[PDB]
Design a protein around this ligand. Sequence first.
Ligand SMILES: CCCCCCCCCCCC(=O)OC[C@H](COP(=O)(O)OCC[N+](C)(C)C)OC(=O)CCCCCCCCCCC
Ligand SMILES: CCCCCCCCCCCC(=O)OC[C@H](COP(=O)(O)OCC[N+](C)(C)C)OC(=O)CCCCCCCCCCC
Ligand SMILES: CCCCCCCCCC(=O)OC[C@H](COP(=O)(O)OCC[N+](C)(C)C)OC(=O)CCCCCCCCC
Ligand SMILES: CCCCCCCCCC(=O)OC[C@H](COP(=O)(O)OCC[N+](C)(C)C)OC(=O)CCCCCCCCC
Ligand SMILES: CCCCCC(=O)OC[C@H](COP(=O)(O)OCC[N+](C)(C)C)OC(=O)CCCCC
Ligand SMILES: CCCCCC(=O)OC[C@H](COP(=O)(O)OCC[N+](C)(C)C)OC(=O)CCCCC
Ligand SMILES: CCCCCCCCCC
Ligand SMILES: CCCCCCCCCC
Ligand SMILES: CCCCCCCCCC
Ligand SMILES: [Cu+2]
Ligand SMILES: [Cu+2]
Ligand SMILES: [Cu+2]
Ligand SMILES: [Cu+2]
Ligand SMILES: [Cu+2]
Lengths: 382, 382, 236
Amino acid sequence: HGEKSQAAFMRMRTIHWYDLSWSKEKVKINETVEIKGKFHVFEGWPETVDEPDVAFLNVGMPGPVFIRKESYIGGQLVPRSVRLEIGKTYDFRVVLKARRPGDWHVHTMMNVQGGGPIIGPGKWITVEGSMSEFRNPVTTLTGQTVDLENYNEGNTYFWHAFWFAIGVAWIGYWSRRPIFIPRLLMVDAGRADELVSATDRKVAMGFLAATILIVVMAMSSANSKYPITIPLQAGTMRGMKPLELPAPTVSVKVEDATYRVPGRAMRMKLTITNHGNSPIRLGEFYTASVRFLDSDVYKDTTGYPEDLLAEDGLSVSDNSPLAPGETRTVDVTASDAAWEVYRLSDIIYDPDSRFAGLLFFFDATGNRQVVQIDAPLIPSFM
Amino acid sequence: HGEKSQAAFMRMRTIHWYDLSWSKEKVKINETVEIKGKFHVFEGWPETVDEPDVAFLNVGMPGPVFIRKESYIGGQLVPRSVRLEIGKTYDFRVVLKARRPGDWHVHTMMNVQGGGPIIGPGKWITVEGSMSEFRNPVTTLTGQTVDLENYNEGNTYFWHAFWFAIGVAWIGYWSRRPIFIPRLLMVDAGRADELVSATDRKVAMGFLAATILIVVMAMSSANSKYPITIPLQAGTMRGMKPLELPAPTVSVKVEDATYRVPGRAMRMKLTITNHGNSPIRLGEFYTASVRFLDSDVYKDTTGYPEDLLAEDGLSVSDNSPLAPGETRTVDVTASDAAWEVYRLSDIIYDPDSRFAGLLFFFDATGNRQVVQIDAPLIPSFM
Amino acid sequence: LLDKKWLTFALAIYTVFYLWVRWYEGVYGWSAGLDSFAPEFETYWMNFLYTEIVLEIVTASILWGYLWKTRDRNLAALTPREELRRNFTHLVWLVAYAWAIYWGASYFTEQDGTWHQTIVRDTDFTPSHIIEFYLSYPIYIITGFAAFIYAKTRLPFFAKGISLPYLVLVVGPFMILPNVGLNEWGHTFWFMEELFVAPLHYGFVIFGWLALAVMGTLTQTFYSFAQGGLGQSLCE
Ligand SMILES: CCCCCCCCCCCC(=O)OC[C@H](COP(=O)(O)OCC[N+](C)(C)C)OC(=O)CCCCCCCCCCC
Ligand SMILES: CCCCCCCCCCCC(=O)OC[C@H](COP(=O)(O)OCC[N+](C)(C)C)OC(=O)CCCCCCCCCCC
Ligand SMILES: CCCCCCCCCC(=O)OC[C@H](COP(=O)(O)OCC[N+](C)(C)C)OC(=O)CCCCCCCCC
Ligand SMILES: CCCCCCCCCC(=O)OC[C@H](COP(=O)(O)OCC[N+](C)(C)C)OC(=O)CCCCCCCCC
Ligand SMILES: CCCCCC(=O)OC[C@H](COP(=O)(O)OCC[N+](C)(C)C)OC(=O)CCCCC
Ligand SMILES: CCCCCC(=O)OC[C@H](COP(=O)(O)OCC[N+](C)(C)C)OC(=O)CCCCC
Ligand SMILES: CCCCCCCCCC
Ligand SMILES: CCCCCCCCCC
Ligand SMILES: CCCCCCCCCC
Ligand SMILES: [Cu+2]
Ligand SMILES: [Cu+2]
Ligand SMILES: [Cu+2]
Ligand SMILES: [Cu+2]
Ligand SMILES: [Cu+2]
């Protein structure tokens, strides 16, 4: 829910999420929903954002309405921050367990150490049941199975209440006698040296000795119980395995790209050159979580969120099949209400009027190619 | 004009400018001169200079005697700072429009975010005409053509004069009465409470209200006129396309490199191995904007600046054609008055006595190869 | 008599000399003054530097020494009218100091700024350093020291003790001159960028603040003015 407020150009050129899939749309408490897909780190990473040398695969949700059971970059679990390489494509997978009933907008996001959150597309997921049914069991290496919902809760409550009671007892011992005005007047009028007299010093010595003794004894007792402990596990994980994508056989040059102010459309002129040996057709333009589709070429069957999906939002002046070896120039219009709803038109406010996106080309046999485009985006007012 | 003062070793190993060309040597006012060439970012980039992650393609000139119409790295306009990769070669092009009459030493320079200016070769360009003839027209996206020489000048003058007059009016209103000594004596001798009495408070309220009202009204008026504005456009540009040079078929090992103190020559011993299938001959040694040529092998026809060009400054002990597959060791002397004029001999003062440069090898058919050499440079005194 | 025409000369000498200096640097800025290693620079600007330093040392010595030997020994036996005349002469000295401070700390300092966005520095002795660091700063230092010495040696109010605000006003702006060591060090080893807001320049800023002691100095001069010649009229 944090997008629509970030700069449009930086939403356009940080990370491109595609091939997203959600295993379920409606789940019960304790059930699992799996979010998969790929993300590409844009080569033209903005200078105001630190390079994703330290990045965390997070989930966008209103608090722990789900718990993150697992998360993978590549094929390996990533509970710590990771190092990503600019220009690479990674596949990810997040496993969530439903915890709180309701309708939640779940995003896949990436946090970068020096640039803030990069929020991917959000999908509404319904959770049914009761929060009282949620369980989070975990088996330790010491041979004990505990529930993370309430483990150590009583111990924490007890120790905090005990020390609070000790402090309250100290203050109350001193508060049985008159507190402020008589003591102030006694300290002012000559030496006081009467408001603190034995056995006050004995009581203070007892409090100090009892505090130190209780701390030492409690530490020793908490070492006998739980004799095996480890420090908090932390540290960025290098060696994230990226996807080894084949080199695209389509080359696209953005010769001038504009947009109307005001308006809900973006227009660009592309020179597409088709290498390889199969006729291709432009089927999709993805800019920032928004997919503009040409319905005559490609249809979405993955249940992409409807507000981010423009089924016929991509119009190509000449979208006839492009024979191999042939190059042509077309005018491409990406038009949808999403362009204004997600404030992609707010790029006119940005200090860097440049866009980036992904074009998906499909051949007759159905196999698709991903090409990346970026160009200056010029507003037009007249 | 800023070189000859920078460290010789850092002038030798930052950026090597070659294939430089100047379209004109003498221009009229409003005429265009184009500066082209290639620059190679040296692999042994000095540690005291930040890597060119944020670099600006600038022009060295005494103020705006020219205006920079356009500048390209690769083939794309670069009005903002760019990211360069160490070890890569880029082609550049700067278009200048003549503005001020005179004889100007024009340099191509590169500014690095954390290391300062890297000045390339400077060429004297003569400008003829009058500065009153210079025009800098520009067409806006709002459909207006303005001259950048005087656009908004009157508005700026008016607003600054208006606010200055308001401040002067305030001070003069308070300055009609006696200022310093009587007021000081009145404030000292008892309460003053007589030097500020109505209608002074009324005048101050009027000044405050009029100031706020005028600011608000002027802002609203400047929003009705010029209803379309954009913020300042900024941001480093990544994705600079470098040149894809063929791998050299010549390998050169600098076995010992010295120079006499004092002297105007540099001597090095090279083991040149000729791969490929054509006899080669060493024709040029470029070290820091200084080109030492072997006149029997190569002649300059690009109008390189004469003080930086040593037509016969490169002497090779055995510069006979090197047959393919053959390796030999020669003694190479680079001697010219430029070595002392540009204070290349001032490397003895540097805390890093290492040099770098480019060797250009030419075959019979004329095609040339660029090999890069770097080695410790050892002064010799006896 | 009271205030005489030494004030006209005090304004005019600085104005005429600095207009000539500005004309000189406008003529020899380019064309013998861009290249610091050229021999024409050595005769048009290094000679300027040497001559101005020698003349500054000689003038400071002569002026301060003369003011000190001609100091008033019998300050007690000074008539109020003579004290008023001396107070006006001190005010003329303060006017000259303010004019010199303007020329040094505003005009030629921001002029060095214009040069910082047109050239690449070749040395610590660029044409603008000759004029700003080694001419105008010493000139206003000499004027301020002379004003302080005149006050101390002619005005009974400023005698019998060193005025703290006057000492700050005279010495702090002086401290910008040794702050040039920070400037060159802060440009060579530190910040290679021509930033005019870099922390390397805060040394001028810190000691530029000390010129705010002009307020304490001026209330002291007002009190010195209003010792015997306060009136009457004033406060009546
Ligand atoms: C607080 C005490 C301050 C002491 C320092 C003052 C600095 C004075 C200038 C240094 C000059 C220098 O050093 O240079 C000497 C220059 C070098 O130029 P040139 O090669 O002869 O070319 C010809 C240059 N014309 C075209 C300017 C002649 O020539 C000169 O003879 C001229 C110097 C004249 C200085 C006196 C006039 C000042 C303005 C009038 C109101 C006072
Ligand atoms: C007796 C009265 C006359 C002399 C007065 C002094 C004039 C300057 C002499 C330079 C001698 C020399 O050797 O030059 C200076 C040498 C470098 O020399 P270079 O590399 O050959 O310079 C060639 C380029 N030029 C031709 C422009 C000079 O070091 C320096 O940069 C020293 C820099 C010091 C900066 C901080 C100074 C702070 C002063 C604070 C005061 C309160
Ligand atoms: C080329 C350098 C020429 C400098 C000439 C200095 C003049 C001598 C200084 C001086 O003592 O006084 C000059 C004037 C008038 O004051 P005087 O009355 O002459 O000073 C002594 C006071 N006394 C007569 C009662 C004993 O007092 C002034 O207000 C003169 C102000 C001059 C401006 C400062 C110029 C300094 C440039 C470096
Ligand atoms: C460089 C940085 C300056 C450091 C600041 C220290 C000075 C601040 C206090 C001050 O100015 O007082 C010194 C006297 C004022 O009279 P006093 O300090 O009372 O002592 C007078 C006797 N004395 C001249 C030997 C000092 O003032 C004078 O007598 C000065 C005139 C005599 C000096 C003339 C010779 C100098 C030629 C270069
Ligand atoms: C209160 C500070 C005044 C500064 C004015 C100044 O810098 O003047 C130089 C500038 C030089 O431009 P210009 O007048 O065209 O004459 C050029 C001569 N050079 C190049 C030597 C400066 O203009 C003048 O000389 C006008 C005279 C103003 C008298 C207070
Ligand atoms: C009163 C505020 C002072 C803040 C200092 C500051 O802005 O320093 C910036 C600089 C960061 O250097 P940067 O701006 O990246 O400089 C880029 C240019 N180079 C690398 C040549 C210095 O940090 C330092 O080196 C320490 C400063 C100590 C101040 C007492
Ligand atoms: C002055 C009190 C120091 C207490 C030290 C206790 C050490 C116990 C080791 C387990
Ligand atoms: C206290 C003065 C506040 C002024 C606010 C003006 C708002 C105008 C909106 C265009
Ligand atoms: C590179 C980080 C520099 C931080 C400088 C902090 C200055 C604070 C002055 C008190
Ligand atoms: Cu959301
Ligand atoms: Cu991407
Ligand atoms: Cu030059
Ligand atoms: Cu190189
Ligand atoms: Cu400077």
